[PDB]
Amino acid sequence: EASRLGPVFDSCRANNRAALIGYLPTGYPDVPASVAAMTALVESGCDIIEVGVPYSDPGMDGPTIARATEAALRGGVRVRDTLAAVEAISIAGGRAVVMTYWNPVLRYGVDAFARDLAAAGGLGLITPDLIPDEAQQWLAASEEHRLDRIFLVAPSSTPERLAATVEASRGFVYAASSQAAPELVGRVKAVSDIPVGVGLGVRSRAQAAQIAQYADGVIVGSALVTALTEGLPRLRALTGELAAGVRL
Amino acid sequence: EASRLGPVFDSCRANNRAALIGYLPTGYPDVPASVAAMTALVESGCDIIEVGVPYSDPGMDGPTIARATEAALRGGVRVRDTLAAVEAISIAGGRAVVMTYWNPVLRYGVDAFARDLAAAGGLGLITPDLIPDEAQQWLAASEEHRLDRIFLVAPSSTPERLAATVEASRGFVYAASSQAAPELVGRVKAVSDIPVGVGLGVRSRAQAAQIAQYADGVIVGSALVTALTEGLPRLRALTGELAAGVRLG
Amino acid sequence: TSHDPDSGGHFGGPSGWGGRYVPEALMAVIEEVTAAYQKERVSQDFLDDLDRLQANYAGRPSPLYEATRLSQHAGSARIFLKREDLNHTGSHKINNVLGQALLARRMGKTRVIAETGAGQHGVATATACALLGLDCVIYMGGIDTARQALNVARMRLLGAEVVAVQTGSKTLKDAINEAFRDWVANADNTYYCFGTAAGPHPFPTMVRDFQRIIGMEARVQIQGQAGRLPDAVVACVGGGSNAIGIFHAFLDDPGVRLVGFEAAGDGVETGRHAATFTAGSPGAFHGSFSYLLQDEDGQTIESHSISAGLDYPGVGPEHAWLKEAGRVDYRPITDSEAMDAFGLLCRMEGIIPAIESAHAVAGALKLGVELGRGAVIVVNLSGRGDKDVETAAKWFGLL
Amino acid sequence: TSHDPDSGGHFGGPSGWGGRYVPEALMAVIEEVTAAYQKERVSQDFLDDLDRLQANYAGRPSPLYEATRLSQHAGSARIFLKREDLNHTGSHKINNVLGQALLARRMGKTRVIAETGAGQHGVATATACALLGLDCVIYMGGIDTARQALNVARMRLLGAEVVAVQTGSKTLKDAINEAFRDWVANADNTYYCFGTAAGPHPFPTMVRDFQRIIGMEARVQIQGQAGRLPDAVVACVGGGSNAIGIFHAFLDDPGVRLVGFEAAGDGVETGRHAATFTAGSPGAFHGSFSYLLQDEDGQTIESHSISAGLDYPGVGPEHAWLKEAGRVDYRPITDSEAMDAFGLLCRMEGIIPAIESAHAVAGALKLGVELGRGAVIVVNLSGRGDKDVETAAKWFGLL
Ligand SMILES: C=C(NCc1c(COP(=O)(O)O)cnc(C)c1O)C(=O)O
Ligand SMILES: C=C(NCc1c(COP(=O)(O)O)cnc(C)c1O)C(=O)O
Ligand SMILES: N#C[C@@H]1N[C@@H](CO)[C@H]1c1ccc(-c2ccccc2F)cc1
């Protein structure tokens, strides 16, 4: 009847605010510490958690995330560690989606990964290198195991492809990138009432507030990894600052 | 008429010996020392001196002669210094021929070089990179200025070319090169009575004596240069041993 | 045609080889390039321009040469060398580059980027950009800049900027990752001149269409010289452009065996190879669903080869399809086998091959022993060895 | 036969240019080579063997490319490049070597020797000897081994012994002297594959006959592409083989200007040059009567050039005869002029020429300014610049 993340965005939209969406990669700095960090995010007030699956050739990841995922892989991180992370988040009372490049999902098995993601309490999948054009197996797996499918749109997206991507998405649309972010969010609002998340290299409280004025979600990742590298207390402090940002 | 070197070979053949033919390059180790060295050869019993003209690219010279000609050219040796060496040799009672590559002769002027060589008392010219095929100007200058013309023959020389090279030569034929050397002299004697000088890298009395059995002249070059590098006394001793070698009775 | 993919870039229907595994951020320019290729491939102006340059600039056709002194080392079979080594810049790469570079100019793009491993695609790209007046940036892995240094200096002389890539394995796959990131950022002004028959649609089809000329010439030349079609046609396989180029014209001749030879490095048992078909499995990598070397979770495994050109853990999707269909067989050749053949081609035929191409010659020698006396084997001699002379002289102790 | 010398090798009269200024010890083998060549130059089976190798092994014909992006630096003249850079081995040298190596096999010789400066002749000879199963010894000046080291390594991989010559200037003239000394000692079994259009008869004529193909092809090609014979044909001049090769077919076209470009080094006023026709005079050198750089006593003056292939104080006798006749003009080009042209060609047309060839390109640009808008100038692009990349990268501040 409705998406898995829909009640989270309605609860935010009822409290007159945007959702804070927090990315961390599994296994950085090691697997136990990363899970303890993801639990800390739930406590520090993240509405949704993006659990990153480290990939050997992460085409779209920036330098902070790329080096962290490289380090997680050196440390022996495995795809199953991500599903353990989703379970620990869900028991703690948080809401988790998985962000992954597509080959790890193919290798695991698209149906099997959906099945096991859903059994861990996972709510959906963010797919940076999977366009709807190739998503037939994922569409079927998503419908059967009741998982949201968050595709990405871009400033460069043609009108036709923007429409097709928004139509194929359930839960929210990850609008990735001067006035480009609000213009892209505007073009999604013109064809659909689906929530839009915005990832813009957010570092601070003021930046999260600006984004909350037009986006239903603020996505933070790079800054969270930078914070965890200095320390786990530094992550709590930053996450609390960003929690206040989205309520403005 | 008789060749300029005719009387020397006739005289040697009457005393049952070969002519000793000694090579030194002008300007090694410097110009005055080389003139003193060539005078010493006359005094020590060289019948004929080959005055070498140092050339920048001497393809037929061995390592010992090539290093020495390089050293001469670094010293600043000139073609006119070879003419002066011939004068000094003539003044000392000696007999000089010049050995040169052809281009220094062309640059000087063939007729003019033949004139000036004859004026200095020079008796002829040994031409290792001039074959009779290209020797038209030289043959004319040679007849005009009464100079002998010593072309080379080799073991590889065909019957036709050997006969043409002997026919074109006056004074002696240079048989340059083991039984190759007597065989080559033997081929020259079958077509002509011209004297044959033989070069074989000779360095000792014994080798000079071997060659004097069949040859009219024994040519020595490399070993004289090696001797002079050690010193002028060593050159005198070696030349004396080679002069004993050419004699047979 | 019978061999082309659907409009999405899929070969073989529901196997699903090829396609586009790329971010939405790239789809506007990918769709732009696809459309421009479809328009220009039937434009007589474009084909006339490409043809004029292939003849007068690049030196086509390349000859087909019967290497008769190799015959005794190949079971008395007859080895014919298709001499792509004689092309301008010294390899097959120039064929694809002139096509794509002309296309970049037709689209109004003002900047060209490329990846290179052996440096031959880099040099060809720089060449075409000099010729057409386009800004050029070549991405090259740091290990490749060191072992193919002659080509770095050629690229710089040709006016191309070169960026040494220090991430991952510092070889071809890592250069491709960096050039991809550049294209994502600069798509509106930049054309990506991709040098092998992999990537998202349209690159596998387009690269193959520009390389097809090799096989079309070879098919005519072998019938002229030998009086019949060959018993086999063989090539080395990196990403797959020279192999697919020579193979394509023989696909519908059922008696012509097709064999691709991939790099096995220290040996397939050692974990230091680039033997994608022998040891890899299906997956999505660098824009396509094809074969790649990957671990149990689907992390790309780093390849290794003495040859910079074959040191790539992926392979192009049309090859995956031809392997599935049983039309082409793919076999491993080790560093040692390749270098033996390198030396042999030097001493027997006076031809210094690329170490890439040496893998194909080594495989041809073995295939000659299987097929026997009088068998006719066409080998694509993909490049010359200028760039590898130091490596090979070191290998044979000639210093 | 109209432009040939007499049976003694002389151009312009029985005591004119050319001839045989050699020792009697070489005459048997010189006469043997002369007789063999006179027999084989009129044998269709020999010319067929040479043609078949030219087409299928060497990849002839070489193309003619109009370098339109040079025009503005050549007074709006039209520079057409005859692309000998695309031959097997990377130069025109292979044309002559294939002919002479085929002749060595016909004569029953088992050992081939050669001189080389740039290393392109040395590589070409090694290549042919590997192809034909002949033992190969190459003599190369010590200075040249250091500045053309890529070609030393290639020769060694091809199976040749490379001997570094330390005598004199340690450059091409001194390599020639050593090769001559080898031949004198080993005439029985050894063929001397001489690499330029100089030397004693029969070499100037034989080398020119095997390079004639360049001009024969170019004369057909230029009429096809430009619609008429050129206003000029130009080439660089070392000993003179690539120049005489392209010039020969245009000698009886009275409207076609012919210009040879010689290496002027630091300048003709400095005494560091190889400008034989500008600064030299007639004399006997390396087997022939021709022009050379020489002092008042007739000693050879050591040449200098940045180009190893033009660093030679002599020139072939056919060029001396053509100079004296008023048919060809010969003109100096300095190191700097040549490097400016080297760089321009890389930058504008994406072709990396030999530094030798860049002298011809430099000369064509000046000639273009002299002749003006629309003048058709054919330039012999004698070889590629891969051997010169290190030197050129250093010249332009690119490592
Ligand atoms: C990767 C590069 N070259 C690969 C290459 C290959 C292998 O690439 P294919 O795309 O498989 O043909 C074969 N032969 C030569 C001479 C090559 O240079 C490059 O130059 O960037
Ligand atoms: C002397 C040598 N090369 C001369 C050369 C020359 C000049 O030599 P010619 O004999 O004048 O053609 C021109 N171009 C190239 C590419 C060359 O390599 C050599 O390689 O042995
Ligand atoms: N995001 C994403 C993907 N993670 C990387 C690994 O695959 C990255 C990627 C890299 C390169 C390509 C590519 C290759 C050839 C031509 C055009 C291309 F775009 C595509 C994707």
Ligand SMILES: N#C[C@@H]1N[C@@H](CO)[C@H]1c1ccc(-c2ccccc2F)cc1
């Ligand atoms: N003696 C004598 C001559 N001093 C040298 C030059 O004057 C030496 C010489 C050197 C080389 C050649 C030569 C060149 C090309 C082909 C065949 C050849 F033999 C000839 C002579």
Ligand SMILES: [Cs+]
């Ligand atoms: Cs060709």
Ligand SMILES: [Cs+]
């Ligand atoms: Cs450029």
Ligand SMILES: [Cs+]
């Ligand atoms: Cs591969």
Ligand SMILES: [Cs+]
């Ligand atoms: Cs010259």
Ligand SMILES: [Cs+]
């Ligand atoms: Cs410089």
